[PDB]
Design a protein around this motif. Structure first.
Motif, short mmCIF file in Angstrom:
data_model
loop_
_atom_site.label_atom_id
_atom_site.label_comp_id
_atom_site.label_asym_id
_atom_site.label_seq_id
_atom_site.Cartn_x
_atom_site.Cartn_y
_atom_site.Cartn_z
N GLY B 55 -24.79 -4.53 43.71
CA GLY B 55 -25.84 -4.57 44.27
C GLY B 55 -26.77 -3.28 43.72
N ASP B 56 -26.36 -2.49 42.76
CA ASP B 56 -26.87 -1.75 42.59
C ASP B 56 -27.77 -2.18 41.66
N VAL B 57 -29.40 -1.55 41.29
CA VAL B 57 -30.19 -2.45 40.27
C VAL B 57 -30.12 -0.92 39.26
N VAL B 58 -29.04 -1.27 37.47
CA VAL B 58 -29.24 -0.46 36.96
C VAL B 58 -30.00 -1.07 35.65
N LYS B 59 -29.72 -0.07 35.05
CA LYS B 59 -31.24 -0.02 33.22
C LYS B 59 -29.63 -0.51 32.46
N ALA B 60 -29.64 -0.72 31.35
CA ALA B 60 -28.14 -1.36 30.01
C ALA B 60 -29.22 -1.63 29.18
N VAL B 61 -28.13 -0.99 27.85
CA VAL B 61 -28.82 -1.01 26.54
C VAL B 61 -27.48 -2.96 26.36
N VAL B 62 -27.91 -3.77 25.53
CA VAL B 62 -27.74 -4.47 24.88
C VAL B 62 -26.16 -4.58 23.60
N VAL B 63 -25.20 -4.33 24.19
CA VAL B 63 -24.57 -4.06 22.70
C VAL B 63 -24.20 -5.52 21.73
N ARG B 64 -23.08 -6.28 22.89
CA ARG B 64 -23.10 -7.88 22.06
C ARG B 64 -23.43 -8.80 22.67
N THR B 65 -23.69 -9.49 21.67
CA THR B 65 -24.83 -10.50 21.81
C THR B 65 -23.80 -12.39 21.25
N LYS B 66 -23.99 -13.58 22.17
CA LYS B 66 -22.96 -14.78 22.08
C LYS B 66 -23.86 -15.35 21.05
N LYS B 67 -25.48 -14.64 20.98
CA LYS B 67 -26.15 -15.73 19.32
C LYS B 67 -26.20 -14.48 18.88
N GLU B 68 -26.12 -15.23 17.40
CA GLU B 68 -25.65 -14.09 16.47
C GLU B 68 -26.91 -13.58 15.64
N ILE B 69 -27.19 -12.53 15.63
CA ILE B 69 -28.12 -11.09 14.98
C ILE B 69 -27.66 -11.52 13.62
N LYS B 70 -29.05 -11.75 12.73
CA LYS B 70 -29.45 -11.72 11.85
C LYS B 70 -29.81 -10.45 11.42
N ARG B 71 -28.67 -9.50 9.76
CA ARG B 71 -29.31 -8.91 9.26
C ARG B 71 -30.72 -9.00 7.91
N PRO B 72 -30.78 -8.18 8.25
CA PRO B 72 -31.84 -7.88 6.55
C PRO B 72 -31.28 -7.98 5.25
N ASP B 73 -30.13 -8.22 5.17
CA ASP B 73 -29.15 -7.86 4.15
C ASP B 73 -28.42 -9.34 4.34
N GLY B 74 -29.13 -10.71 4.95
CA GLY B 74 -28.99 -11.67 4.34
C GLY B 74 -27.23 -12.60 5.52
N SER B 75 -27.03 -11.00 5.86
CA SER B 75 -25.58 -11.79 7.03
C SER B 75 -25.76 -11.47 8.02
N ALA B 76 -24.54 -11.81 8.60
CA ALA B 76 -25.24 -12.11 10.66
C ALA B 76 -23.97 -11.75 11.36
N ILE B 77 -23.65 -11.52 12.13
CA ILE B 77 -22.63 -11.18 13.02
C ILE B 77 -23.02 -12.06 14.71
N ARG B 78 -21.87 -12.04 15.36
CA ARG B 78 -21.99 -13.03 16.47
C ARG B 78 -20.38 -12.20 17.14
N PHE B 79 -20.63 -12.59 18.30
CA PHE B 79 -19.37 -11.62 19.77
C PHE B 79 -18.98 -12.74 20.32
N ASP B 80 -17.86 -12.97 21.13
CA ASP B 80 -17.78 -13.34 21.80
C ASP B 80 -18.11 -13.43 23.54
N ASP B 81 -18.53 -12.48 23.83
CA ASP B 81 -19.29 -12.08 25.24
C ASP B 81 -20.95 -11.80 24.99
N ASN B 82 -21.62 -11.51 25.93
CA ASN B 82 -22.78 -10.98 26.48
C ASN B 82 -22.20 -9.49 26.70
N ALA B 83 -22.39 -8.39 26.16
CA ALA B 83 -21.74 -7.12 26.67
C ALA B 83 -23.24 -6.23 26.60
#
Ligand SMILES: [K+]
Ligand SMILES: [Mg+2]
Ligand SMILES: [Mg+2]
Ligand SMILES: [Mg+2]
Ligand SMILES: [Mg+2]
Ligand SMILES: [Mg+2]
Ligand SMILES: [Mg+2]
Ligand SMILES: [Mg+2]
Ligand SMILES: [Mg+2]
Ligand SMILES: [Mg+2]
Ligand SMILES: [Mg+2]
Ligand SMILES: [Mg+2]
Ligand SMILES: [Mg+2]
Ligand SMILES: [Mg+2]
Ligand SMILES: [Mg+2]
Ligand SMILES: [Mg+2]
Ligand SMILES: [Mg+2]
Ligand SMILES: [Mg+2]
Ligand SMILES: [Mg+2]
Ligand SMILES: [Mg+2]
Ligand SMILES: [Mg+2]
Ligand SMILES: [Mg+2]
Ligand SMILES: [Mg+2]
Ligand SMILES: [Mg+2]
Ligand SMILES: [Mg+2]
Ligand SMILES: [Mg+2]
Ligand SMILES: [Mg+2]
Ligand SMILES: [Mg+2]
Ligand SMILES: [Mg+2]
Ligand SMILES: [Mg+2]
Ligand SMILES: [Mg+2]
Ligand SMILES: [Mg+2]
Ligand SMILES: [Mg+2]
Ligand SMILES: [Mg+2]
Ligand SMILES: [Mg+2]
Ligand SMILES: [Mg+2]
Ligand SMILES: [Mg+2]
Ligand SMILES: [Mg+2]
Ligand SMILES: [Mg+2]
Ligand SMILES: [Mg+2]
Ligand SMILES: [Mg+2]
Ligand SMILES: [Mg+2]
Ligand SMILES: [Mg+2]
Ligand SMILES: [Mg+2]
Ligand SMILES: [Mg+2]
Ligand SMILES: [Mg+2]
Ligand SMILES: [Mg+2]
Ligand SMILES: [Mg+2]
Ligand SMILES: [Mg+2]
Ligand SMILES: [Mg+2]
Ligand SMILES: [Mg+2]
Ligand SMILES: [Mg+2]
Ligand SMILES: [Mg+2]
Ligand SMILES: [Mg+2]
Ligand SMILES: [Mg+2]
Ligand SMILES: [Mg+2]
Ligand SMILES: [Mg+2]
Ligand SMILES: [Mg+2]
Ligand SMILES: [Mg+2]
Ligand SMILES: [Mg+2]
Ligand SMILES: [Mg+2]
Ligand SMILES: [Mg+2]
Ligand SMILES: [Mg+2]
Ligand SMILES: [Mg+2]
Ligand SMILES: [Mg+2]
Ligand SMILES: [Mg+2]
Ligand SMILES: [Mg+2]
Ligand SMILES: [Mg+2]
Ligand SMILES: [Mg+2]
Ligand SMILES: [Mg+2]
Ligand SMILES: [Mg+2]
Ligand SMILES: [Mg+2]
Ligand SMILES: [Mg+2]
Ligand SMILES: [Mg+2]
Ligand SMILES: [Mg+2]
Ligand SMILES: [Mg+2]
Ligand SMILES: [Mg+2]
Ligand SMILES: [Mg+2]
Ligand SMILES: [Mg+2]
Ligand SMILES: [Mg+2]
Ligand SMILES: [Mg+2]
Ligand SMILES: [Mg+2]
Ligand SMILES: [Mg+2]
Ligand SMILES: [Mg+2]
Ligand SMILES: [Mg+2]
Ligand SMILES: [Mg+2]
Ligand SMILES: [Mg+2]
Ligand SMILES: [Mg+2]
Ligand SMILES: [Mg+2]
Ligand SMILES: [Mg+2]
Ligand SMILES: [Mg+2]
Ligand SMILES: [Mg+2]
Ligand SMILES: [Mg+2]
Ligand SMILES: [Mg+2]
Ligand SMILES: [Mg+2]
Ligand SMILES: [Mg+2]
Ligand SMILES: [Mg+2]
Ligand SMILES: [Mg+2]
Ligand SMILES: [Mg+2]
Ligand SMILES: [Mg+2]
Ligand SMILES: [Mg+2]
Ligand SMILES: [Mg+2]
Ligand SMILES: [Mg+2]
Ligand SMILES: [Mg+2]
Ligand SMILES: [Mg+2]
Ligand SMILES: [Mg+2]
Ligand SMILES: [Mg+2]
Ligand SMILES: [Mg+2]
Ligand SMILES: [Mg+2]
Ligand SMILES: [Mg+2]
Ligand SMILES: [Mg+2]
Ligand SMILES: [Mg+2]
Ligand SMILES: [Mg+2]
Ligand SMILES: [Mg+2]
Ligand SMILES: [Mg+2]
Ligand SMILES: [Mg+2]
Ligand SMILES: [Mg+2]
Ligand SMILES: [Mg+2]
Ligand SMILES: [Mg+2]
Ligand SMILES: [Mg+2]
Ligand SMILES: [Mg+2]
Ligand SMILES: [Mg+2]
Ligand SMILES: [Mg+2]
Ligand SMILES: [Mg+2]
Ligand SMILES: [Mg+2]
Ligand SMILES: [Mg+2]
Ligand SMILES: [Mg+2]
Ligand SMILES: [Mg+2]
Ligand SMILES: [Mg+2]
Ligand SMILES: [Mg+2]
Ligand SMILES: [Mg+2]
Ligand SMILES: [Mg+2]
Ligand SMILES: [Mg+2]
Ligand SMILES: [Mg+2]
Ligand SMILES: [Mg+2]
Ligand SMILES: [Mg+2]
Ligand SMILES: [Mg+2]
Ligand SMILES: [Mg+2]
Ligand SMILES: [Mg+2]
Ligand SMILES: [Mg+2]
Ligand SMILES: [Mg+2]
Ligand SMILES: [Mg+2]
Ligand SMILES: [Mg+2]
Ligand SMILES: [Mg+2]
Ligand SMILES: [Mg+2]
Ligand SMILES: [Mg+2]
Ligand SMILES: [Mg+2]
Ligand SMILES: [Mg+2]
Ligand SMILES: [Mg+2]
Ligand SMILES: [Mg+2]
Ligand SMILES: [Mg+2]
Ligand SMILES: [Mg+2]
Ligand SMILES: [Mg+2]
Ligand SMILES: [Mg+2]
Ligand SMILES: [Mg+2]
Ligand SMILES: [Mg+2]
Ligand SMILES: [Mg+2]
Ligand SMILES: [Mg+2]
Ligand SMILES: [Mg+2]
Ligand SMILES: [Mg+2]
Ligand SMILES: [Mg+2]
Ligand SMILES: [Mg+2]
Ligand SMILES: [Mg+2]
Ligand SMILES: [Mg+2]
Ligand SMILES: [Mg+2]
Ligand SMILES: [Mg+2]
Ligand SMILES: [Mg+2]
Ligand SMILES: [Mg+2]
Ligand SMILES: [Mg+2]
Ligand SMILES: [Mg+2]
Ligand SMILES: [Mg+2]
Ligand SMILES: [Mg+2]
Ligand SMILES: [Mg+2]
Ligand SMILES: [Mg+2]
Ligand SMILES: [Mg+2]
Ligand SMILES: [Mg+2]
Ligand SMILES: [Mg+2]
Ligand SMILES: [Mg+2]
Ligand SMILES: [Mg+2]
Ligand SMILES: [Mg+2]
Ligand SMILES: [Mg+2]
Ligand SMILES: [Mg+2]
Ligand SMILES: [Mg+2]
Ligand SMILES: [Mg+2]
Ligand SMILES: [Mg+2]
Ligand SMILES: [Mg+2]
Ligand SMILES: [Mg+2]
Ligand SMILES: [Mg+2]
Ligand SMILES: [Mg+2]
Ligand SMILES: [Mg+2]
Ligand SMILES: [Mg+2]
Ligand SMILES: [Mg+2]
Ligand SMILES: [Mg+2]
Ligand SMILES: [Mg+2]
Ligand SMILES: [Mg+2]
Ligand SMILES: [Mg+2]
Ligand SMILES: [Mg+2]
Ligand SMILES: [Mg+2]
Ligand SMILES: [Mg+2]
Ligand SMILES: [Mg+2]
Ligand SMILES: [Mg+2]
Ligand SMILES: [Mg+2]
Ligand SMILES: [Mg+2]
Ligand SMILES: [Mg+2]
Ligand SMILES: [Mg+2]
Ligand SMILES: [Mg+2]
Ligand SMILES: [Mg+2]
Ligand SMILES: [Mg+2]
Ligand SMILES: [Mg+2]
Ligand SMILES: [Mg+2]
Ligand SMILES: [Mg+2]
Ligand SMILES: [Mg+2]
Ligand SMILES: [Mg+2]
Ligand SMILES: [Mg+2]
Ligand SMILES: [Mg+2]
Ligand SMILES: [Mg+2]
Ligand SMILES: [Mg+2]
Ligand SMILES: [Mg+2]
Ligand SMILES: [Mg+2]
Ligand SMILES: [Mg+2]
Ligand SMILES: [Mg+2]
Lengths: 249, 122
Positions: B55-83
């Motif tokens: 029930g608390d309303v809190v703040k958090a930073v996202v550390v993993r996403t299931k949607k892949e993040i793309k990187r300037p070097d042309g690569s990408a990374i993808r996680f099994d959860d959203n965390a």
RNA sequence: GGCGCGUUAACAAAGCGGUUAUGUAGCGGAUUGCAAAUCCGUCUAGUCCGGUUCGACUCCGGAACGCGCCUCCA
RNA sequence: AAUGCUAAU
RNA sequence: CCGAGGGUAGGGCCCGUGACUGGGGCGAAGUCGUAACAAGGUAGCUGUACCGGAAGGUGCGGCUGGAU
RNA sequence: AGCGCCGGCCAACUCCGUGCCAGCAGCCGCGGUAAUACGGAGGGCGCGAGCGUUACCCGGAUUCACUGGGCGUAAAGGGC
RNA sequence: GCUAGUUGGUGGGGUAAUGGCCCACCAAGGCGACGACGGGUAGCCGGUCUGAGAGGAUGGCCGGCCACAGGGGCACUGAG
RNA sequence: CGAUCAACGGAUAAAAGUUACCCCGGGGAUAACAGGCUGAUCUCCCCCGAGCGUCCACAGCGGCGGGGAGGUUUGGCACCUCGAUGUCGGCUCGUCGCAUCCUGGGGCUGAAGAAGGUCCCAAGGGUUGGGCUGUUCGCCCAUUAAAGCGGCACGCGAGCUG
RNA sequence: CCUAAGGUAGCGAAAUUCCUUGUCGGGUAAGUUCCGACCUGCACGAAAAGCGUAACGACCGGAGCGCUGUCUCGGCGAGGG
RNA sequence: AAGUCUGGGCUAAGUGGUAAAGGAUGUGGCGCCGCGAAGACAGCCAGGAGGUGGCUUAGAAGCAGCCAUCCUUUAAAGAG
RNA sequence: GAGCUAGCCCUGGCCAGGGUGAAGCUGGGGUGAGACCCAGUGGAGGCCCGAACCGGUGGGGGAUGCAAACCCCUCGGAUGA
């Protein structure tokens, strides 16, 4: 304060039929004191017993300076005597309670329309084309407190505005009349307390013909003079112990 | 891509297990959060006697996403959860441990203590 | 807002163009160790303003306040 | 016929 | 294969807590009455039933721990 | 050289102050203007490098009764 | 009221060694008001405290046994 | 001579309701929507300067009164439409006004700075996502530079919804 | 005072409550609906029955899980037009 | 269609060509006083002082709030 | 005019398959006898799932229709009033 007219609420404490009788004594003591002060007294609420006393009496003291003097009488007053309700000649310690309060105003209540917001809108329910297109419903908001009243009781916005403002006023009134009561209530409890044999500010011991105000230690023996109304000696000793209580530092 | 209603697992030891995103704290009207973004979230499931509770309303930073993040070097990374890692208004973690890998994008975005505490930065 | 009804003393409640309503209470007395209950007595009146009439609590008109009813077709 | 009597050796 | 444990689902027991609600104990004073103790002014008590602001009342049957 | 206590149980008492206040209290109770019961003091009683208190165990408790209790009216005979 | 490795059998694995200890199969048994099962609590004893005794209470130090070595599981090495 | 035939030029000697189960003939001669006229109500802006603001009428305020503007509200009127002008909210698509919510530019400040108040200029662009309710409205949650107010038949049903 | 007599039990902001989104509690980040209460019931109430009730319901509410093109927010593809 | 017709004046706001209280060194015309070479009005040049405050106030002491506003070197200098 | 529709009268016809498993009966237990318990058997019912058949719940389409009530998905009853 000191200069306004005062109200005195004499209630019977622990003692039963005789507490009410002692309350009748304190009642005559202040009406007769008031005359020896030029102050004007009128009863506002009385509740007599058949044995002669009152379970409660309220009376005002109309005089420029009534609160300045009567304010020292607030508290529990203890009597020790052989009561007229006693048949084995025993001495009973009983209590009456005196409440001293400045005469409140009566200030009239009207709405400051600048702290009020009026919303109009369409109403809910039946009406056909009329209810669909007419701003008949009204909300009135008391902006400081935030409390709202709505009205779609009639078909007319002006009648719903009038009825809504009435109810809003009536409600803010009850809110004002209730905080005034909660101040009045706690104040009364600061003075009268439980009315227990402790909590005493003064004793009127009939056997030893003594009157002792344990707040300052003053003790006279003119008990008949006290009960008849000559309370000026005691007040002054409190009045002077009052100023010596204002000696800094 | 996290948005209001989105559930995230909690990658710290604050006691929160599942938070539900209610705001993407990124300007007037951000549609989505990714790694390194902060959200406001409701705590939907927690273990007993934790820092934060249900029930608390809190703040958090996202550390993993299931949607892949793309990187300037042309690569990408993808996680099994959203965390996400629960933080305070100073962006610091509120727990003392960070479970699982986190995106290296967090380093670039000033979440260094989190990067410090994560067992793998990818 | 409309229509109807009302305002009488401490409370409740009536009649009446001229006139102690009534009940309970209150007040004085009796009885009782005392208090009740009871007994003998007793007492305080018509919301405001204006009319009518010899005379108005009573009739007419209005004001304030209270109550009851209605405010529907959109 | 007919109710009641607080509370301090 | 077994397997620490982790996870999923459904049960069981226990503790704490909860708007409100129920009665209970207590109190040197309050309001109503006066049911019980004397034949307590209708003997009391009783199981049960119905009813009543409240003690209680009344019906049916039982007891004497009931008077004269 | 200190600490507890001096109404009864329980050993050790007077004066002042207080006046159902302040307070004492393990129980029964003290205190409401002459308090061995509150507070001090003098005096006394008990112990003494200790004296008291709190918590807990057994005892007193023959008050779970084997030793060693009871059930007509005191709690207790089961409706048969 | 409890019980499916549950109770017994046969056969085998395992050990230093008996054993359902483990396994495959067979049989349908095993336990319980003399309290099974469940829940609570506790390391146990020599002793110790109390008590006339009986009993009650308790198990700190010392001696004996057990259990554990951050929370769990596991085996290696070895006479252990 | 017998009339509160008082609906008082008096239909019968003799008579109440209901219809959302309704029907026909009519009317925009007459109501409900929208427009129109009007602007009491509504919204906004001024005049006066008593008084507040420690001091000081005018930083911010404005007693009692006074003058207007707008044409969003509630009404008044009954002028087109009753051989029909579909009526709330939502959705979709916008577009306009400016009395400006934000962003830009200012003056005054009871403007130290930062942040505000107040008024002036400014309509180019922007003006979030949710809980409740059919809701408009409003409240609430989390944000935001900001979460503007209005006109367009209370914009838009031969575009959808219902 | 009045009435023929003055609504009992049970229930109650309700398929009934105008004020009203009453108030308190719960659920939600946030709850005009929902559920539990309170009771000044505008305008419940006992066979036009009162209050409950397992099971039943293409009836009408409220919530959660699962899953989704309902939606953020649309994209592409198929066939009949 | 018929005068860029004639003469006198006014307006500078496109007022004309959309409105009020009220506000204003807009402009033009009438007035009616006043002050002026007893040197006026504006500017500048000074002097603008003193017993210094009285009530109120620790100072409010010329320059908060109250009570009046007394007099000198003089041409004037006000306790402003 | 009851060749539509509503009710009734006479006389016929129809209802795949699967599921649940009442009474009774039989056996065993129990008892003084019983009630009753257990197992088996049994096959009840405006019982369950689901075609035909009878319907018409929500949605979409259709709306000068294929149709003056239809079509697709979905959904109710289906040994019984
Ligand atoms: K109608
Ligand atoms: Mg007595
Ligand atoms: Mg306004
Ligand atoms: Mg409306
Ligand atoms: Mg509605
Ligand atoms: Mg209607
Ligand atoms: Mg309807
Ligand atoms: Mg209208
Ligand atoms: Mg994890
Ligand atoms: Mg976690
Ligand atoms: Mg929860
Ligand atoms: Mg919770
Ligand atoms: Mg953390
Ligand atoms: Mg009268
Ligand atoms: Mg009266
Ligand atoms: Mg009468
Ligand atoms: Mg009459
Ligand atoms: Mg009388
Ligand atoms: Mg009398
Ligand atoms: Mg008497
Ligand atoms: Mg007269
Ligand atoms: Mg008169
Ligand atoms: Mg008269
Ligand atoms: Mg009169
Ligand atoms: Mg009159
Ligand atoms: Mg009608
Ligand atoms: Mg007698
Ligand atoms: Mg009597
Ligand atoms: Mg009594
Ligand atoms: Mg008597
Ligand atoms: Mg009594
Ligand atoms: Mg007595
Ligand atoms: Mg396992
Ligand atoms: Mg497990
Ligand atoms: Mg209680
Ligand atoms: Mg009695
Ligand atoms: Mg009796
Ligand atoms: Mg008696
Ligand atoms: Mg009696
Ligand atoms: Mg009796
Ligand atoms: Mg008799
Ligand atoms: Mg009985
Ligand atoms: Mg009776
Ligand atoms: Mg001792
Ligand atoms: Mg002694
Ligand atoms: Mg002592
Ligand atoms: Mg002791
Ligand atoms: Mg005393
Ligand atoms: Mg003395
Ligand atoms: Mg004495
Ligand atoms: Mg003494
Ligand atoms: Mg003692
Ligand atoms: Mg002493
Ligand atoms: Mg020693
Ligand atoms: Mg013993
Ligand atoms: Mg003991
Ligand atoms: Mg024995
Ligand atoms: Mg005994
Ligand atoms: Mg007995
Ligand atoms: Mg017997
Ligand atoms: Mg096996
Ligand atoms: Mg085993
Ligand atoms: Mg077998
Ligand atoms: Mg055994
Ligand atoms: Mg344990
Ligand atoms: Mg242990
Ligand atoms: Mg033991
Ligand atoms: Mg011993
Ligand atoms: Mg013994
Ligand atoms: Mg120990
Ligand atoms: Mg271990
Ligand atoms: Mg070991
Ligand atoms: Mg270990
Ligand atoms: Mg450790
Ligand atoms: Mg370990
Ligand atoms: Mg008539
Ligand atoms: Mg006529
Ligand atoms: Mg007629
Ligand atoms: Mg004529
Ligand atoms: Mg006729
Ligand atoms: Mg006739
Ligand atoms: Mg007629
Ligand atoms: Mg008719
Ligand atoms: Mg109808
Ligand atoms: Mg109907
Ligand atoms: Mg019909
Ligand atoms: Mg009908
Ligand atoms: Mg018809
Ligand atoms: Mg017809
Ligand atoms: Mg018709
Ligand atoms: Mg017609
Ligand atoms: Mg026609
Ligand atoms: Mg017309
Ligand atoms: Mg006409
Ligand atoms: Mg209209
Ligand atoms: Mg019309
Ligand atoms: Mg209209
Ligand atoms: Mg329209
Ligand atoms: Mg109109
Ligand atoms: Mg039109
Ligand atoms: Mg106008
Ligand atoms: Mg106007
Ligand atoms: Mg107006
Ligand atoms: Mg203006
Ligand atoms: Mg001022
Ligand atoms: Mg100023
Ligand atoms: Mg004003
Ligand atoms: Mg005006
Ligand atoms: Mg105007
Ligand atoms: Mg308009
Ligand atoms: Mg206009
Ligand atoms: Mg309009
Ligand atoms: Mg109208
Ligand atoms: Mg209009
Ligand atoms: Mg019209
Ligand atoms: Mg006309
Ligand atoms: Mg029309
Ligand atoms: Mg036509
Ligand atoms: Mg036409
Ligand atoms: Mg037409
Ligand atoms: Mg717009
Ligand atoms: Mg502007
Ligand atoms: Mg700006
Ligand atoms: Mg700016
Ligand atoms: Mg600044
Ligand atoms: Mg500053
Ligand atoms: Mg500014
Ligand atoms: Mg703009
Ligand atoms: Mg919004
Ligand atoms: Mg929701
Ligand atoms: Mg919504
Ligand atoms: Mg809404
Ligand atoms: Mg609303
Ligand atoms: Mg803001
Ligand atoms: Mg800003
Ligand atoms: Mg419209
Ligand atoms: Mg609109
Ligand atoms: Mg529209
Ligand atoms: Mg349409
Ligand atoms: Mg529409
Ligand atoms: Mg259209
Ligand atoms: Mg159209
Ligand atoms: Mg169209
Ligand atoms: Mg059209
Ligand atoms: Mg509808
Ligand atoms: Mg519909
Ligand atoms: Mg009723
Ligand atoms: Mg009754
Ligand atoms: Mg009853
Ligand atoms: Mg009731
Ligand atoms: Mg209610
Ligand atoms: Mg509610
Ligand atoms: Mg209900
Ligand atoms: Mg109702
Ligand atoms: Mg309501
Ligand atoms: Mg409502
Ligand atoms: Mg609410
Ligand atoms: Mg809540
Ligand atoms: Mg939950
Ligand atoms: Mg709530
Ligand atoms: Mg809803
Ligand atoms: Mg409820
Ligand atoms: Mg209420
Ligand atoms: Mg009903
Ligand atoms: Mg009904
Ligand atoms: Mg009936
Ligand atoms: Mg019900
Ligand atoms: Mg039942
Ligand atoms: Mg039910
Ligand atoms: Mg049910
Ligand atoms: Mg059904
Ligand atoms: Mg059905
Ligand atoms: Mg149904
Ligand atoms: Mg749901
Ligand atoms: Mg869900
Ligand atoms: Mg879901
Ligand atoms: Mg789509
Ligand atoms: Mg959308
Ligand atoms: Mg396509
Ligand atoms: Mg195609
Ligand atoms: Mg010319
Ligand atoms: Mg000429
Ligand atoms: Mg101009
Ligand atoms: Mg201009
Ligand atoms: Mg022009
Ligand atoms: Mg112009
Ligand atoms: Mg036929
Ligand atoms: Mg046929
Ligand atoms: Mg047949
Ligand atoms: Mg069939
Ligand atoms: Mg078959
Ligand atoms: Mg079948
Ligand atoms: Mg099956
Ligand atoms: Mg079958
Ligand atoms: Mg079978
Ligand atoms: Mg079978
Ligand atoms: Mg058979
Ligand atoms: Mg058999
Ligand atoms: Mg069978
Ligand atoms: Mg069958
Ligand atoms: Mg069936
Ligand atoms: Mg079925
Ligand atoms: Mg089935
Ligand atoms: Mg089915
Ligand atoms: Mg057919
Ligand atoms: Mg069909
Ligand atoms: Mg049919
Ligand atoms: Mg269909
Ligand atoms: Mg569907
Ligand atoms: Mg359709
Ligand atoms: Mg359709
Ligand atoms: Mg059709
Ligand atoms: Mg056609
Ligand atoms: Mg079809
Ligand atoms: Mg088909
Ligand atoms: Mg189908
Ligand atoms: Mg089906
Ligand atoms: Mg079917
Ligand atoms: Mg079926
Ligand atoms: Mg079948
Ligand atoms: Mg048949």
């Amino acid at each position: 304060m000191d200069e306004r007219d005062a109200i005195v609420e004499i209630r019977a404490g622990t003692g039963g039929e005789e507490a009410a009788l002692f309350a009748r004594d304190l009642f005559n003591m202040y009406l007769r004191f008031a005359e020896e002060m030029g102050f004007e007294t009128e009863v506002l609420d009385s509740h007599p017993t058949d044995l002669g006393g009152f379970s409660k009496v309220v009376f005002e003291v109309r005089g420029p300076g009534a609160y300045g003097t009567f304010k020292y009488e607030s508290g529990v007053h203890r009597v020790q005597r052989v009561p007229v309700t006693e048949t084995q000649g025993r001495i009973h310690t009983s209590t009456a309670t005196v409440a001293v309060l400045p005469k409140a105003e009566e200030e009239d209540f009207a709405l400051n329309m600048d702290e009020i917001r009026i919303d109009v809108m369409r109403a809910s329910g039946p009406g056909g084309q009329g209810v669909n297109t007419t701003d008949s419903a009204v909300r009135v908001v008391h902006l400081p407190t935030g409390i709202m009243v709505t009205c779609q009781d009639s078909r007319s916005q002006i009648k719903n505005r009038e009825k809504a403002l009435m109810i809003l006023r009536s409600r803010l009134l009850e809110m004002k009349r209730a905080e005034e009561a909660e101040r009045l209530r706690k104040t009364r409890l600061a003075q009268i307390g439980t009315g227990e044999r402790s909590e005493k500010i003064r004793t009127y011991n009939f056997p030893q013909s003594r009157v002792t105000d344990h707040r300052i230690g003053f003790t006279t023996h003119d008990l008949e003079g006290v009960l008849s109304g000559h309370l000026t000696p005691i007040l002054e000793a409190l009045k002077r112990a009052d100023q010596e209580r204002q000696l800094a530092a | 891509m996290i948005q209001p209603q989105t559930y995230l697992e909690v990658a710290d030891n604050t006691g929160a297990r599942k938070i539900m995103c209610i705001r993407v704290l990124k300007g007037s009207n951000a549609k989505y959060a990714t790694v390194g973004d902060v959200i406001v979230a409701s705590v939907k499931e927690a273990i007993p006697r934790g820092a934060v509770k249900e029930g608390d309303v809190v703040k958090a930073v996202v550390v993993r996403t299931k949607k892949e993040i793309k990187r300037p070097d042309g690569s990408a990374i993808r996680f099994d959860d959203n965390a996400a890692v629960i933080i305070n208004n100073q962006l610091e973690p509120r727990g003392t441990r960070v479970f699982g890998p986190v995106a290296r994008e967090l380093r670039e975005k000033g979440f260094m203590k989190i990067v410090s505490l994560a067992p793998e930065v990818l």
